[PDB]
């Protein structure tokens, strides 16, 4: 679901069948926020107005769809859909993902806001900026409690400028069970940092 | 055909209906070629319902032989999607396309989708429209933030300065707590020097509230 390239790489994507569909696996691009496309239908015809990158092959089982030379508007998620009268699915879908050099998070960490502690709730943020890649774990710890169902990620797209991602995790306790604890501590590792990077604060 | 247009968002309840239209507008059409194609977030798409050529009314997926009714008006060239007995899985983005057949060795046609309409959101959940609340997030390359905390439903707007920070600001996608509200945090990098000779203000705008609220962040 899932694959980093850079511009002028060639990627192909393998769609394999169960029966024999034939020639009746169409490709679709879906770029984030805007409803599908297509790009080839009948296994192999492009659509009129797709570039000639695209290329679709394969007959029976197994059906490829190639981008010879990656550009800058390629990068965009390609769902496989098979239509026969054996399985009509569409696709997990594959993410093309522009690809960089390893960046690590610059991470901060928010303890709740006194106009918050009124409401009963209190919620710890912590904050991952600007990294590459994706793959980036937080690790919540109270006293070193390791925590591990009171947080929620919720991570960017690759920055159009950056091509770097951003990870928010926030911590919300109940007013009461935040105040029985001194310690908290966020843990994150990276594949940019030599060593995993804790942002602590006691209350 | 060459426009196909869809109705708009549409909050609804468990065990509800939504009726979702499809236009269709422009040149030369044909109301029973559009098909359904439904996606829930964060993943991939699952085709709903079609018509059928020789008989004139819906075919469905398997997964919907239960209620759902597609209905083409044929003058006004348009295609309604009822879907009732509606639950929280059922909460995605349903897309109209038109079918162009390739093989019908059934009583119903499949093959490729050419124009796909723009796609209306259907957010069904057991909660009701509520207001956000701003909480700052204060700083010690330098990060300040606000916390949206408790809203309903999906469409919130986070400005900086009343629209003139846009170097750095982030706002995260919102996350979906086990109350039912969503919460979204939009933080900001800016100078350490600028902390106190720079006043930092953030700007929420929950219209489904008619919500305005503004709440300015201070080491």
């Known amino acids: 679901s899932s694959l980093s390239a850079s511009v002028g790489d060639r990627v192909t994507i393998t769609c394999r069948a169960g029966?024999?569909?034939?020639?009746?696996l169409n490709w679709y691009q879906q770029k984030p926020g805007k409803a599908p496309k297509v790009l080839i239908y009948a296994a192999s015809n492009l659509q009129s107005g797709v570039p000639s990158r695209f290329s679709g092959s394969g007959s029976g089982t197994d059906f490829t769809l190639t981008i010879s030379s990656l550009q800058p508007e390629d990068f965009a998620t390609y769902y496989c859909?098979?239509?026969?009268?054996?399985?009509?699915?569409f696709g997990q879908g594959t993410k093309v993902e522009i690809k960089r050099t390893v960046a690590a998070p610059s991470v901060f960490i928010f303890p709740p806001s006194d106009e918050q502690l009124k409401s009963g709730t209190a919620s710890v943020v912590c904050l991952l900026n600007n990294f590459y890649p994706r793959e980036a774990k937080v690790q919540w710890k109270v006293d070193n409690a390791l925590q591990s169902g009171n947080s929620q990620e919720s991570v960017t797209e690759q920055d159009s400028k950056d091509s770097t991602y951003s990870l928010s995790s926030t911590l919300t306790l109940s007013k009461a069970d935040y105040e029985k604890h001194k310690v908290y501590a966020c843990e994150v590792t990276h594949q940019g940092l030599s060593s995993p990077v804790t942002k602590s604060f006691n209350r | 055909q060459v426009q196909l247009v869809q109705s708009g968002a549409e909050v609804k309840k468990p065990g509800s209906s939504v009726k979702v239209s499809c236009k269709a507008s422009?040149?030369?059409?044909?109301?029973?070629?559009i098909s359904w194609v439904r996606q829930a977030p964060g993943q991939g798409l699952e085709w709903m319902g079609g018509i059928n050529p020789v008989l004139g009314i819906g075919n469905y997926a398997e997964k919907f032989q239960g209620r759902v009714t597609i209905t083409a008006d044929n003058p006004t060239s348009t295609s309604y999607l009822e879907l009732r007995s509606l639950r929280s899985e059922d909460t995605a983005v349903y897309y109209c396309?038109?079918?162009?057949?390739?093989?019908?060795?059934?009583?119903?046609?499949?093959?490729?989708?050419?124009?796909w309409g723009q796609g209306t959101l259907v957010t069904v959940s057991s909660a009701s429209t509520k207001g956000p609340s701003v909480f700052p997030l204060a700083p010690s390359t330098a990060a300040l933030g606000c916390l949206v905390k408790d809203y309903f439903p999906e469409p919130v707007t986070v400005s900086w300065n009343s629209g003139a920070l846009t170097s750095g600001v982030h706002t995260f996608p919102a996350v979906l707590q086990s109350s039912g509200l969503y919460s979204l945090s939009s933080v900001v990098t800016v100078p350490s020097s600028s902390l106190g000779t720079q006043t930092y203000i953030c700007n929420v705008n929950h219209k489904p509230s008619n919500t305005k609220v503004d709440k300015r962040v201070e080491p």
């Open positions: 859909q098979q239509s026969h009268s054996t399985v009509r699915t």
């Open positions: 029966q024999n569909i034939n020639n009746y």
């Open positions: 396309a038109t079918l162009h057949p390739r093989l019908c060795r059934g009583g119903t046609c499949w093959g490729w989708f050419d124009p």
């Open positions: 422009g040149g030369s059409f044909s109301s029973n070629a």
